[PDB]
A paper describes a structure:
Cytoplasmic dynein-1 is a conserved, minus-end-directed microtubule motor critical for cell division and long-range intracellular transport in eukaryotic cells. Dynein, a member of the AAA + (ATPase associated with various cellular activities) family, forms a 1.4 MDa dimer composed of two copies each of heavy (HC), intermediate (IC), light intermediate (LIC), and three (TCTEX, LC8, and ROBL) light chains (LC), with the IC, LIC, and LC known as accessory chains. Cellular and structural studies have shown that dynein primarily exists in a pseudo-twofold symmetric, autoinhibited Phi state incompatible with movement along microtubules. LIS1 plays essential roles in the activation of dynein, including relieving autoinhibition and helping assemble the fully active DDA transport complexes.
Residue numbers in the entry:
A (entry chain i), B (entry chain d): 1 to 89
C (entry chain h), D (entry chain g): 110 to 140
E (entry chain k), F (entry chain v): 13 to 113
G (entry chain e): 1161 to 1353
Amino acid sequence: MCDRKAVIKNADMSEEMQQDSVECATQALEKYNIEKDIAAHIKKEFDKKYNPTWHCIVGRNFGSYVTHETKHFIYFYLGQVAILLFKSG
Amino acid sequence: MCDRKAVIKNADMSEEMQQDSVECATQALEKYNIEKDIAAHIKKEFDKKYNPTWHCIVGRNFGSYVTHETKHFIYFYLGQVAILLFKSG
Amino acid sequence: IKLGMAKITQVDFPPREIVTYTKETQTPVMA
Amino acid sequence: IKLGMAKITQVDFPPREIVTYTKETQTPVMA
Amino acid sequence: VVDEVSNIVKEAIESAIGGNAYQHSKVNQWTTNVVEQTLSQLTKLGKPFKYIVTCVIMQKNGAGLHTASSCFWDSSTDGSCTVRWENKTMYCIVSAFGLSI
Amino acid sequence: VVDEVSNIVKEAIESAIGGNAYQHSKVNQWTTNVVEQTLSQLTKLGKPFKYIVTCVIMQKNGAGLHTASSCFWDSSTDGSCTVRWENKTMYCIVSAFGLSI
Amino acid sequence: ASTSDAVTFITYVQSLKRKIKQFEKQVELYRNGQRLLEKQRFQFPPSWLYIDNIEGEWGAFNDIMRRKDSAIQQQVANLQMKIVQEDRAVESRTTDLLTDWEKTKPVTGNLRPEEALQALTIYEGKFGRLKDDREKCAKAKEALELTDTGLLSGSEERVQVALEELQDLKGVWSELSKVWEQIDQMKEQPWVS
């Protein structure tokens, strides 16, 4: 599996949203090594924690300018893959 | 120059929105030598055109799960980057 | 004061509905 | 019936707090 | 009886709209039921005043709203009572303008 | 007159806000100004009724506000009028009451 | 918005999910077939997606169906509750209206056949509408988790009695129209002729 060490160097969100994203990433990485499923779980946690609508994008070599509401872009990096949970809603 | 076209893999959106997104993403990628700067330029063009603000996905690894509202949602590959740009609200 | 035949006129603004017509697909990483 | 100026009820709803910023972001790259 | 009017308005709002799952065909029905209950509370009170109650039922969506009622009478024989109620994703605000004949 | 009152309310809304949007620090101010304009229009009418005007400025952000006013007033001599004004983003839902005394 | 509309939409969502189980099985099998084609390099032509492209289109359809089913399940509770309440109220009102029409249909003298037929049709329509509303409330409660007495209860018996009285009133309207045709002919024939 993957020991999801949430290296949130720049988590442009509140502590509760960052903790929710970290817990979702940890559970998803424990369950499976699927990047899309991990991003989906982070998106579900963000939708639970910061209301509709929320989404999370995870990639290895990806570029996406996080454009959402403030305290709604949960960015915890499981190593280097930053699961940017920018809640666009 | 990479062709950020779209294949008929999943297409339920507005054609004008899809064309604007593809052109903005490819033009920003060509203009900015940094992937982060290209994503920033794409976000700036999208927020200037279809109001501010929303974040899209253009990168090597892409995948998530959300209630994608129609007319601004698709899931394809725009050349060397997966085309998954869905606007929820 | 015996009130006459009077009623209430309700004209509410339309709310916002959620259309979860998600276009789920296979989005693979580069390989 | 005498009518005159008075003070009316001042009830209002404060707006929401939100900031929209298209800040450049990219995940860290490891070989 | 401003306090009694506010209590009856809050009770009617809880009985009609409250905070339950509203519907498109049920939000207007709940507002109408709240207005009818406010009229019943005004009529059964027996106070000699032609009260005007503006039942306000809205859904919480982050938009501003300010329902302020201005009358033209004397403060000795007329008055208004304010009751505030909130829901999980809706609202039910009642303001009655009791005006003497 | 009901038609004259509605036309005066619409004209006052056009002269005060019309189709422009509102602000967080000015929505209640616009509502108060519209209510005062409606009261002035009712006072200049000369109809022997204690004018009661309520003006609510609502934003167009999905907040579905049910605007109504139930009053214990006679149908053939008095009345309460409620309507929602159309704008770009300021759906003004103002209810006015007129009771002869 | 209507209770019957919500019940019909919930039933449509259930049938759509029943078909979409096999549809998503076919879509997943087609995604696997396109993946095997890609294993042989046989991707679909670029105008479309691959066979995985067809799988992605099927997945988009499945996600849309899931969202529609979520909306239907959300509206089903309100639909079933409104259906059952309207059914009980309509059953009582239809029983009362059918009894009243069968007792005191439009039995006036001149052109009375049309009035009696209208009264009988109104009573029968009230009884049938009450029975149908009770049936729709029972169906909406079954398919949406609502509480409605959609069985042959006292409201159903009153609706049946109202329907029988309305059928009697309609037959009276028909016989009265048949008599009134000849009566009007005898009245409107020329006095000299």
